[PDB]
């Protein structure tokens, strides 16, 4: 019962407004503490440079017009509220692809009698990160993800990290990929004096055995046939079939390995480079 009267007292459209953000004493900044929590890295479509993650981002901020006297209301401490009605500092990716920006669920938020708000909606994010594919597959991937309020500059809000590292209490082993460290850092452009943002860096490592067994063994296996054709005697008349077949197989593997690598013309994969070299060698062999 008293919960309903509490909600009607707090959520009065005539008394409480949503479009204006709280501030006192000459437009003081409202500190917004956000920290990320990685659920499970679900996929890395390396061909499209898209990383799909499940994220729980927690956000805390102080708000003064929402307070109430806890003594009168049966000594209640915390109350649940909908997100669509109380104001909320927008925090969304920038390097996000797919058009999707905001969170998916719009959860309920916890409100204490002091006025602090602690809110965490879960979401799925599709970030865009460049693939430094040189040591395929024995490599590392450096994916960046940025948070920032697209609507407010550093004049009403100010983002502050809670902890230096992303939390992994609700993590599951991603299977193929294995994480190393999840650093986070607050950037600050002094030239703009308005630009703020939080950047989390994900350094990811690939467990190599799958690709190894699937591609490296057949590749070196068939390319061991390079210097093999010449020990064959010419009188039998069979060099042509073997050599042309080897060249064809190498072309096939080249096309495949070019299909799996993202078309990043910034650099050439090492495996592809070696395979092109041995292709030139085997055509010199055929001539």
């Amino acid at each position, epitope marked *: 019962d008293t919960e309903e009267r509490l909600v009607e007292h707090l959520l009065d459209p005539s008394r409480y407004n949503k479009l204006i953000r709280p501030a006192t004493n000459g437009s003081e900044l409202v500190t917004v503490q956000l920290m990320v929590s990685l659920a499970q890295l679900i996929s890395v479509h390396e061909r499209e440079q898209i990383m799909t993650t499940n994220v729980w981002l927690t956000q805390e901020w102080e708000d003064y017009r929402l307070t109430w006297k806890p003594e009168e209301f049966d000594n209640m401490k915390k109350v649940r509220l909908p997100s669509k009605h109380i104001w909320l500092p927008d925090v969304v990716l920038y390097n996000n692809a797919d058009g999707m920006y905001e969170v998916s669920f719009y959860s309920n938020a916890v409100v204490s009698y002091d006025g602090s708000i602690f809110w965490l909606p879960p979401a799925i994010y599709k970030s865009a990160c460049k693939i430094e594919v040189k040591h395929f597959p024995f490599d590392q991937q450096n994916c960046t993800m940025k948070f920032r309020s697209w609507t407010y500059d550093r004049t009403e809000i100010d983002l502050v990290l809670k902890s230096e*590292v992303a939390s992994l*209490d609700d993590f599951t*082993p991603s299977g193929e990929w294995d994480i190393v*460290a*999840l650093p986070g850092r607050r950037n600050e452009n002094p030239d703009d004096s308005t630009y703020v943002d939080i950047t989390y860096d994900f350094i990811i490592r690939r467990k190599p055995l799958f690709y190894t067994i699937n591609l490296i063994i057949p590749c070196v296996l068939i390319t061991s046939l390079a210097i093999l054709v010449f020990y064959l005697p010419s009188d039998c008349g069979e060099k042509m079939t073997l050599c042309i077949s080897v060249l064809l197989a190498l072309t096939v593997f080249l096309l495949l390995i070019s299909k799996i690598v993202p078309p990043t013309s910034l650099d050439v994969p090492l495996v592809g480079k070696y395979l092109m070299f041995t292709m030139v060698l085997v055509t010199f062999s055929i001539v």
Partner: antibody, heavy 118, light 113 residues
Framework: VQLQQSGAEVMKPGASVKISCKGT????????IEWVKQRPGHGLERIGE????????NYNEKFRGKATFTADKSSKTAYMQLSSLTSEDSAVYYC????????????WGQGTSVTVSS | DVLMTQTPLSLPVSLGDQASISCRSS???????????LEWYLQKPGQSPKLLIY???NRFSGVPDRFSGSGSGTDFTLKISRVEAEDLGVYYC?????????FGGGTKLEIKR
């Protein structure tokens, strides 16, 4: 932040010993924890590190099959199962926090002295 | 494993003197990003190791300025300006390029008279 370890331990050769590492004051399940082995004679060698979030482990090529780590997420504790023990491994063991490619190794443990003799 | 060699084994130097210690790697330990991740450690007798230099081109927050470190792509040198009574102990190297990580050999350092 603060680190805790187990007390002194003695055992007959050939058996197994499990030492504990307690951590508080930070996000325990967020970054690596590596241990350092120091023989009372000289040198510093590692034993391995684990990520208390996942089961991602690695070992130095000299101590393969000698130690097996284990981490717990609910209780902020890292364990290590020890293989067949010989009288050449009686030394002092450490624990420390670490994070690759960035700021790292700013705190330590207090030291765990393990001695093995008949 | 990238083995590490420290030189010398023991370098007795008196109070106020400048001392230089070299730390060489078996391979190149420069990461593809363009930054070499190496650590210097200080251990005192009967205590846990301390930190003085991380990311050699940088310095730790809490260590005085008398310490300095630099080096080329492979050869590394830790330098001290004025030796005090507190800097007694043994130094160590730690590389952060390849997996697994490794320490050095241990460089002994005491005073001389």
């Amino acid at each position: 932040v603060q680190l805790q370890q187990s007390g002194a331990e003695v055992m007959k050769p050939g058996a197994s010993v499990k030492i504990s590492c307690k951590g508080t004051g930070y996000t325990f399940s967020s970054y690596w924890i590596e241990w350092v082995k120091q023989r009372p004679g000289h040198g510093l060698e590692r034993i391995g590190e684990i990520l208390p979030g996942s089961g991602s482990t690695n070992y130095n090529e000299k101590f393969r099959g000698k130690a097996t780590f284990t981490a717990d997420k609910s209780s902020k504790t890292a364990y290590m199962q020890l293989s067949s023990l010989t009288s050449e491994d009686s030394a002092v063991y450490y624990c420390a926090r670490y994070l690759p490619y960035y700021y790292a190794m700013d705190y330590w443990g207090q030291g765990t002295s393990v001695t093995v003799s008949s | 494993d990238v083995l590490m060699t420290q030189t010398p084994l023991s370098l007795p130097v008196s109070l106020g003197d400048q001392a230089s210690i070299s730390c060489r790697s078996s391979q190149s330990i420069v990461h593809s990003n363009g930054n070499t991740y190496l650590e210097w450690y200080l251990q005192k007798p009967g205590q846990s190791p301390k930190l003085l230099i991380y990311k050699v081109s940088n310095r730790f927050s809490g260590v005085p300025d008398r310490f300095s470190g630099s080096g080329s792509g492979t050869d590394f040198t830790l330098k001290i300006s004025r030796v005090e009574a507190e800097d007694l102990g043994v130094y160590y190297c730690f590389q952060g390029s390849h997996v697994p990580w490794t320490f050095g050999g241990g460089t002994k350092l005491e005073i001389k008279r």
